[PDB]
């Protein structure tokens, strides 16, 4: 099991001549969503989206709620400011995003951290690996970089990532240990689907695994077959786990020459499988 992380994802969208912008926030420990915020909800609050965070008292909900209401206002200002920087009209919808978080080392201290901002689906500004400096994607973002340098905003990020961020992560990991500190390995199988006199499809499935990281490959006696393999995007099961499959077309009668190979952090050893009716 790799290093654990705490991360947050914010989205604000402008709706012109149709009211003020919408602000959504979500929080995760690894791939497990544990909280949400939605500026459209009555008396909007940071809400639980996992069972183990409900333990937290009212003081934790009130503080987390207030921080998200302030963010929503800050992102509305940002959307306005960006129109000026890019000389854009009032007519169109625009999007402003942020993603940030921390990772926990084997010593129980900060391993690494990040903080990124994007405008209209493009990089805007990002905190560097050293947590002491910024990378601006273009001349507009350079204005922000100068402003945040003047305010030494990087120092405020570094102190959070080293302190409160990893403090919260350790709390969440202990509180939800039964689920968060447990890797669930994949349940695997191979299906066969005839196609023509030239080919039969072999599909290698991986089901019910957690976390989402996985490696699925096909080999023909030692040589990887990725070139014309169909590898779908990792997809949610709906219960907190993930699925994936990888398929290839092989000549009829040569199914036993192909093996599927699966690596995941929940497996004591990698798996090898084949079509075995």
């Amino acid at each position: 099991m790799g290093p654990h992380s705490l991360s947050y994802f914010y989205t604000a969208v402008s709706r012109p001549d149709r009211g003020e912008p919408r602000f959504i926030a979500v929080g995760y420990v690894d791939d497990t969503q544990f909280v949400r915020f939605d500026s459209d909800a009555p008396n909007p609050r940071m809400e639980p989206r996992a069972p183990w965070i409900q333990q937290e008292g009212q003081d934790y909900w009130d503080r987390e709620t207030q921080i998200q209401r302030d963010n929503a206002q800050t992102f509305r200002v940002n959307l306005r400011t960006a129109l000026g920087y890019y000389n854009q009209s009032e007519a169109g919808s625009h999007t402003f995003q942020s993603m940030y978080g921390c990772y926990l080392g084997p010593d129980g201290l900060l391993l690494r951290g990040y903080s990124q901002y994007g405008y209209d689906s493009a990089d805007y500004i990002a905190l560097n690996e050293d947590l002491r400096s910024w990378t601006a994607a273009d001349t507009a973002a350079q204005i922000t970089k100068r402003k945040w340098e003047a305010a030494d905003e990087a120092e405020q990020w570094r102190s959070y990532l080293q302190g409160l961020c990893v403090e919260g992560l350790r709390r969440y990991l202990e509180m939800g240990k039964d689920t968060l500190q447990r890797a669930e390995p994949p349940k695997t199988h191979v299906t066969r689907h005839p196609s023509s006199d030239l080919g039969v499809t072999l599909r290698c499935w991986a089901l019910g695994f957690y976390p989402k990281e996985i490696s699925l490959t096909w080999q023909r006696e030692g040589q990887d077959q990725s070139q014309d393999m169909e590898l779908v995007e990792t997809r949610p099961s709906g219960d907190g786990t993930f699925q994936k499959w990888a398929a290839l077309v092989v000549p009829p009668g040569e199914e036993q020459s192909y093996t599927c190979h699966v690596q995941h952090e929940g497996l004591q050893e990698p798996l090898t499988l084949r079509w075995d009716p």
């Binding site: 947050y8 921080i67 998200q68 302030d70 940002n78 960006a82 920087y85 942020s98 305010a151 409160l164």
Partner: peptide, 9 residues
């Protein structure tokens, strides 16, 4: 625990 005071761009 979220970051407490985001700064405008």
């Amino acid at each position: 625990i979220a970051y407490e005071r985001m700064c405008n761009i």
